[PDB]
Amino acid sequence: SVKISDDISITQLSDKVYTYVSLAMVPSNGMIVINNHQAALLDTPINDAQTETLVNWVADSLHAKVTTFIPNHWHGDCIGGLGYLQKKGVQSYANQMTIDLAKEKGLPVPEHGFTDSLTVSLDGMPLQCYYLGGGHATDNIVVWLPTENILFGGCMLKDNQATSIGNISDADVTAWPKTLDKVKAKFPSARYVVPGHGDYGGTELIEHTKQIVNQYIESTSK
Ligand code: NA
What we know:
zinc, Beta-lactamase_class-B_CS, eight-stranded mixed beta sheet, signal, Metallo-beta-lactamase, Chain A
């Protein structure tokens, strides 16, 4: 990874897909997808400033203008810099459930809402968004890049070194493992599998995570 400003670093997984780690002392993940000098931002850092720096480096260093935004769910490590994006005039798409929780919380609201699946065309490149059930957040979705075989699973996925379930204040714990099943069943050809925090890996993150969730369900039923 390439270090940059505001506790932010970035790694390129392909010609068109980059994943970033934004530190706020917790590190959170997101993606930068680029096609024709246009970019999609999947999750924002925790606040506008980190988001501004990221959006600037994508222009400056990547020569791509951020025109699209898709959040994983309503948390700050997904929509924390949305306010600023909206000031940049960025178009956004989110699970309708994310939009409603965001309205109700007086949080920046994503623009267009879908309920099951959505395929956003970034000037031609497809960004497939799916809501497959509650997990880490009752509203969590996953974004799939069919052309790249890259899945950004978001916070419902843990990295290979994680051992804990984390914040379950907004989780649907018992749905979490069934949703991970649908994901494994749905994207068996994923080359890279990016989690909400930590290192990206492959589809093995789905099972490892399911293990943690099941261990949690097992531990609180004794
Ligand atoms: Na994130």
